[PDB]
Amino acid sequence: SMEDVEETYIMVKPDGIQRGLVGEIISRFEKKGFKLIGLKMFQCPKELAEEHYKDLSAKSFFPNLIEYITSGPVVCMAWEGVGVVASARKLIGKTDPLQAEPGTIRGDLAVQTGRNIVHGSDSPENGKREIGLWFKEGELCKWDSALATWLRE
Amino acid sequence: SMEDVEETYIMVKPDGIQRGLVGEIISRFEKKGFKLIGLKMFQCPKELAEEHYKDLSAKSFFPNLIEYITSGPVVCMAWEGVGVVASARKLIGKTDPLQAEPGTIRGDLAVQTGRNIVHGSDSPENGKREIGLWFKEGELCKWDSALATWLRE
Amino acid sequence: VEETYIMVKPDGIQRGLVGEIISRFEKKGFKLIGLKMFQCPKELAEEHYKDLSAKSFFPNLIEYITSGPVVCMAWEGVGVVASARKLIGKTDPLQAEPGTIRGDLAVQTGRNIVHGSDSPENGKREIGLWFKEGELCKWDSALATWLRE
Amino acid sequence: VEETYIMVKPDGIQRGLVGEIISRFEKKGFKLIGLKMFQCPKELAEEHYKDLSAKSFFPNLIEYITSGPVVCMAWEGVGVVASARKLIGKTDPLQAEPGTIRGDLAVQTGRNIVHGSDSPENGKREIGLWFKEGELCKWDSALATWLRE
Amino acid sequence: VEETYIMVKPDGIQRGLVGEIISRFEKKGFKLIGLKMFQCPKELAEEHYKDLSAKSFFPNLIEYITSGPVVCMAWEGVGVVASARKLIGKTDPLQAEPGTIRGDLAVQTGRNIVHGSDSPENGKREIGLWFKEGELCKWDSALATWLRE
Amino acid sequence: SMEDVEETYIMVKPDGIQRGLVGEIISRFEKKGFKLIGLKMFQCPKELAEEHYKDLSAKSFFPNLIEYITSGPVVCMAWEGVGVVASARKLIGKTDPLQAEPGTIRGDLAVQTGRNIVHGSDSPENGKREIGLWFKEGELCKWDSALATWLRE
Numbered sequence: 001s002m003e004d005v006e007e008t009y010i011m012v013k014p015d016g017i018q019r020g021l022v023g024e025i026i027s028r029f030e031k032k033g034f035k036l037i038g039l040k041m042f043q044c045p046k047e048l049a050e051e052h053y054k055d056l057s058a059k060s061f062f063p064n065l066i067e068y069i070t071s072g073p074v075v076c077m078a079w080e081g082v083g084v085v086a087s088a089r090k091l092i093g094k095t096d097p098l099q100a101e102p103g104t105i106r107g108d109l110a111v112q113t114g115r116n117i118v119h120g121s122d123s124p125e126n127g128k129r130e131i132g133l134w135f136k137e138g139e140l141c142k143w144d145s146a147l148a149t150w151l152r153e
Numbered sequence: 154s155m156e157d158v159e160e161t162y163i164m165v166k167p168d169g170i171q172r173g174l175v176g177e178i179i180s181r182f183e184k185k186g187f188k189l190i191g192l193k194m195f196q197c198p199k200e201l202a203e204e205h206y207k208d209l210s211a212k213s214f215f216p217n218l219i220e221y222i223t224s225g226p227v228v229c230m231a232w233e234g235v236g237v238v239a240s241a242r243k244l245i246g247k248t249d250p251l252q253a254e255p256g257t258i259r260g261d262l263a264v265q266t267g268r269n270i271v272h273g274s275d276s277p278e279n280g281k282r283e284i285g286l287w288f289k290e291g292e293l294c295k296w297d298s299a300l301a302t303w304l305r306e
Numbered sequence: 307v308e309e310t311y312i313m314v315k316p317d318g319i320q321r322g323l324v325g326e327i328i329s330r331f332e333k334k335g336f337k338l339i340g341l342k343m344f345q346c347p348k349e350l351a352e353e354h355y356k357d358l359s360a361k362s363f364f365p366n367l368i369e370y371i372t373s374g375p376v377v378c379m380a381w382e383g384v385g386v387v388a389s390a391r392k393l394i395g396k397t398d399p400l401q402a403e404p405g406t407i408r409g410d411l412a413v414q415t416g417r418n419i420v421h422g423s424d425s426p427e428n429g430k431r432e433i434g435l436w437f438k439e440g441e442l443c444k445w446d447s448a449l450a451t452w453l454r455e
Numbered sequence: 456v457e458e459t460y461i462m463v464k465p466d467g468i469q470r471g472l473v474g475e476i477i478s479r480f481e482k483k484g485f486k487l488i489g490l491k492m493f494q495c496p497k498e499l500a501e502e503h504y505k506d507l508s509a510k511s512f513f514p515n516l517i518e519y520i521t522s523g524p525v526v527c528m529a530w531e532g533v534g535v536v537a538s539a540r541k542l543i544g545k546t547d548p549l550q551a552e553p554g555t556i557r558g559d560l561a562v563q564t565g566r567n568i569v570h571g572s573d574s575p576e577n578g579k580r581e582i583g584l585w586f587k588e589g590e591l592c593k594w595d596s597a598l599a600t601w602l603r604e
Numbered sequence: 605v606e607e608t609y610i611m612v613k614p615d616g617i618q619r620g621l622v623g624e625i626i627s628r629f630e631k632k633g634f635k636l637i638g639l640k641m642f643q644c645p646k647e648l649a650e651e652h653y654k655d656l657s658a659k660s661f662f663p664n665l666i667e668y669i670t671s672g673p674v675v676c677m678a679w680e681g682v683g684v685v686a687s688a689r690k691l692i693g694k695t696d697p698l699q700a701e702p703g704t705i706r707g708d709l710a711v712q713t714g715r716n717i718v719h720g721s722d723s724p725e726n727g728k729r730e731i732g733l734w735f736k737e738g739e740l741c742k743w744d745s746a747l748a749t750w751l752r753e
Numbered sequence: 754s755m756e757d758v759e760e761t762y763i764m765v766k767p768d769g770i771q772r773g774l775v776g777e778i779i780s781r782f783e784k785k786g787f788k789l790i791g792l793k794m795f796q797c798p799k800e801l802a803e804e805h806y807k808d809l810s811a812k813s814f815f816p817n818l819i820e821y822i823t824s825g826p827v828v829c830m831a832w833e834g835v836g837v838v839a840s841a842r843k844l845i846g847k848t849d850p851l852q853a854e855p856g857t858i859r860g861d862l863a864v865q866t867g868r869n870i871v872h873g874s875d876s877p878e879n880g881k882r883e884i885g886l887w888f889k890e891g892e893l894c895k896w897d898s899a900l901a902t903w904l905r906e
């Protein structure tokens with residue numbers, strides 16, 4: 001089968017780190033069958049995070065948002081796969097954890113919106129933008145999976 | 154508008170114990186991020202069980218509910234958190250396990266309405282009712298969660 | 307009592323999800339009455355996919371389920387047929403909801419790791435097709451009363 | 456039948472390990488007969504640790520054991536005391552072996568998340584010190600015939 | 605390549621441990637080449653436990669092994685026989701260390717949920733006794749290069 | 754509590770990645786209670802892998818080793834904690850996954866020495882060394898665990 005493998009940026013937030021969910025979140029996607037090509041614990045500089053949420057820079061929560069997202073280290077992840085962006089969004093769950101369906105990362109492991117543990121790109125366009133914003137040039141590591149023949153047709 | 158801290162009475166029904174599921178159910182709620190302020194293996198006295206199911210006292214099966222809930226030990230739990238009530242019902246799943254969705258407790262662990270493992274208050278008003286009903290005035294334990302600031306803003 | 311047929315496909319084995327899938331049905335509360343690693347011969351696979359014989363993918367499908375061993379299973383319980391389907395998830399893993407088998411453990415339709423009868427009729431058919439006279443095992447669950455009224 | 460006293464300490468609750476610890480003993484096969492989240496008043500704690508009153512760490516200990524609610528437990532089964540001591544692991548989480556509770560989930564003796572009666576006589580003493588009578592519950596385990604002969 | 609016979613005793617099935625026990629061997633890295641739920645006949649139960657024939661617990665043993673269906677398994681991998689022994693843990697569940705199957709999920713010797721050949725030749729001998737000719741399925745793991753050099 | 758906190762270098766070898774065990778491994782230490790201060794997927798250059806295994810350079814397996822450790826990305830890690838070095842090694846198991854006791858990382862998830870899915874510093878000094886060899890000045894993230902007070906005195 002031929003079908004482009006998109007990339008999506010997935011980020012475990014400060015709270016996710018504090019609660020020790022870094023291993024758990026990663027394990028969810030590893031079991032799903034997606035490839036990890038970019039990974040790193042990272043203390044996000046204020047500028048980068050402000051660039052990341054550039055679109056929300058006018059909002060009244062923006063200050064508080066940047067404050068939190070930089071208040072502690074986060075984990076930067078880049079996942080490759082076919083239809084992985086939307087898939088990631090599904091596995092993550094609704095923005096509001098209380099409304100997230102059990103089985104999803106937020107519905108299983110979080111309770112409040114302002115602390116929803118993780119971020120998934122909302123589109124392949126943003127997946128590219130974010131992976132290029134949070135990751136330096138040669139940080140990504142591409143590799144052929146040994147299970148490639150058993151993950152995809 | 155911001156919602157107040159809430160309390161709910163979650164109960165592991167007789168079958169939950171027989172199948173050694175007390176631990177996993179407590180875990181699902183500990184993992185979600187709520188705070189356990191009430192817990193005890195309890196032998197529900199007939200009078201207490203009667204008050205618990207008072208809204209069904211007119212039902213022809215009312216006897217079964219009382220009889221059954223008194224047939225063996227149960228685990229009483231009192232959980233706290235903003236929106237914990239509506240959330241607990243969500244992690245628990247539809248009454249008929251066969252219909253509860255994969256990911257919910259009943260959805261992943263049960264097969265018949267009658268032996269649907271756990272119970273959670275159906276409303277914030279009923280949560281306070283059941284907690285005060287099942288727990289003796291000194292059985293509730295209040296404490297400050299060290300992860301409070303990472304669970305909610 | 308209702309019985310359904312559930313099978314882990316070659317990719318489920320390769321990826322080592324046999325124990326996982328089984329555990330999920332055990333925990334749910336259904337009784338396992340049939341189990342066996344089996345290398346499916348072409349003709350039997352074709353028989354299994356009888357109705358898709360005119361389809362375009364048919365051959366690929368036949369290769370896929372014979373490209374490695376499978377693990378046949380016979381599960382019993384009231385309404386197990388539909389429940390099993392719900393636990394397996396949508397045919398397309400990307401579409402199946404998190405919490406289901408394909409929703410958590412697969413990424414593509416052509417390799418969606420598991421199978422479940424879609425009807426009580428096919429349940430008997432498929433079980434009667436993959437299991438031989440006597441390979442099934444009956445037993446009384448000690449937790450029977452704590453699983454059903 | 457033999458019963459032992461197991462208690463999840465304050466750090467255990469603070470770290471959301473109650474469910475996990477209970478599950479281990481459940482999955483092991485012993486029967487739970489007593490359970491409760493309890494706020495240990497200083498005197499009960501000092502009586503439990505009666506023998507250490509003279510030691511310099513006494514103050515710290517009492518503060519710690521009462522710094523938050525604990526979860527009291529009572530389990531039943533032949534050899535449950537020693538086994539529970541084995542499942543829990545050496546006093547020092549760093550020396551505790553991988554597979555044991557403290558070994559898998561803790562990092563320091565002063566925060567070694569759980570307790571377990573070190574002998575059957577102590578099991579009775581502690582269950583009697585931490586529980587009130589009506590608190591223990593007796594019941595018949597459906598799976599007994601499959602747990603023992 | 606060395607093979608060993610692993611089997612889930614009847615107490616394992618009644619307690620829903622089939623999937624969990626297989627997973628321990630899938631996660632370890634070993635290859636499943638034999639599997640089937642089987643109702644063990646008294647005669648076959650006797651040949652297997654020939655060495656314990658003159659033991660006083662023998663009779664109870666034979667009735668136990670025949671008390672319900674069991675799950676027969678064959679795993680491949682160099683050193684598997686010895687590795688399975690460890691994963692299984694000491695005969696008396698109460699003495700098997702945490703981390704092992706008997707140490708985490710059993711409480712008495714007469715209901716130790718699992719079996720494993722104690723040597724390579726007993727593995728060969730046991731697979732020939734529990735599995736018929738083609739019930740074994742030969743296949744190669746796509747992860748071969750990452751499990752052994 | 755005046756106890757000295759050391760750091761240890763823990764790395765997920767190429768096979769760990771191939772086998773989707775990155776998460777599981779991370780969760781073992783996360784749940785143990787140690788702190789993650791360094792983490793990154795990385796494709797190791799022969800030169801770096803040799804200066805890392807210089808003490809085995811004369812061995813007959815060295816050549817293969819070097820190629821194995823560089824045959825694909827690995828996941829570098831820096832863990833902090835009192836006695837984390839010795840603990841981490843205990844948590845990993847014997848060099849031979851067939852000997853490693855069940856419950857340890859290698860005894861639970863591997864079947865052969867040359868593919869023992871993970872590495873951990875064998876001493877506090879090699880701890881400092883390896884972290885310095887694999888992590889650049891500034892890749893390590895310092896932070897305060899909200900549970901620090903419940904993990905230690």
Ligand SMILES: Nc1nc2c(ncn2[C@H]2C[C@H](O)[C@@H](COP(=O)(O)OP(=O)(O)OP(=O)(O)O)O2)c(=O)[nH]1
Pocket residue numbers: 604656661664665695713714716718719720721722
């Ligand atoms: N009912 C009963 N069974 C016993 C007693 N001692 C031993 N057995 C059973 C369970 C033991 O695993 C078996 C003797 O087993 P072996 O030491 O020959 O081998 P093994 O360690 O592989 O365990 P297995 O065949 O899996 O049950 O017979 C006893 O006192 N009472």
Ligand SMILES: Nc1nc2c(ncn2[C@H]2C[C@H](O)[C@@H](COP(=O)(O)OP(=O)(O)O)O2)c(=O)[nH]1
Pocket residue numbers: 753809814817818821847848866867868869872873874875
């Ligand atoms: N490919 C290959 N690698 C080997 C062989 N023997 C040892 N090694 C490698 C992997 C071992 O982890 C490493 C030696 O490690 P060690 O100093 O005994 O301690 P450890 O940090 O591995 O626990 O050398 C071997 O026989 N073949």
